[PDB]
């Protein structure tokens, strides 16, 4: 379709330069700092998690018809009695593990659904707490570098 070659090449450029700047440590945007802090906090969370339990990806027996209900249940119990930055990190890592488990077990359809369920939960039930507690900037100060 008209213009898609050109558009795809522009996305490769943007993606490669972004990978390369953040690789060398440079946070250029505001959300770039947040994303970088989130990726690293996710990595640390999972390192501790798997060091204490099994792999976070093995603890989940999920199907497309059943994935939603399972996701909403685990998340609702995770925040049932409070929110904090660490549990928010756990919430991202959980979603990440769901996606990895889905592609590995050949249910790639679930990936962009899980992203939507996460974004909806993040925007409806976590974003008020985040605003009351300094916004993503406070998170970057606590978990970046």
């Amino acid at each position: 379709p008209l213009g898609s070659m050109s558009q795809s090449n522009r996305e490769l450029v943007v993606d490669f330069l972004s990978y390369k700047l953040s690789q060398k440590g440079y946070s250029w945007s505001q959300m770039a700092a947040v994303k970088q802090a989130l990726r690293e906090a996710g990595d640390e969370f999972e390192l501790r998690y798997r060091r204490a339990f099994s792999d976070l990806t093995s603890q989940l027996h999920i199907t497309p018809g059943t994935a939603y209900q399972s996701f909403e249940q685990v998340v609702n119990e995770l925040f049932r009695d409070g929110v904090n930055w660490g549990r928010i990190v756990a919430f991202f890592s959980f979603g990440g593990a769901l996606c990895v488990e889905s592609v590995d077990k050949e249910m790639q359809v679930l990936v962009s659904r899980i992203a939507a369920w996460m974004a909806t939960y993040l925007n409806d039930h976590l974003e008020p707490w985040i605003q009351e507690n300094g916004g993503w900037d406070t998170f970057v100060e606590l978990y970046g570098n």
Partner: peptide
């Protein structure tokens, strides 16, 4: 239950994470 145990492991690992910051 099955997912109750999962969210408990997530909850306690996150809390440990939160304290250490």
């Amino acid at each position: 239950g099955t997912m109750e145990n999962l969210s408990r492991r997530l909850k306690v690992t996150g809390d440990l994470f939160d304290i250490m910051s």
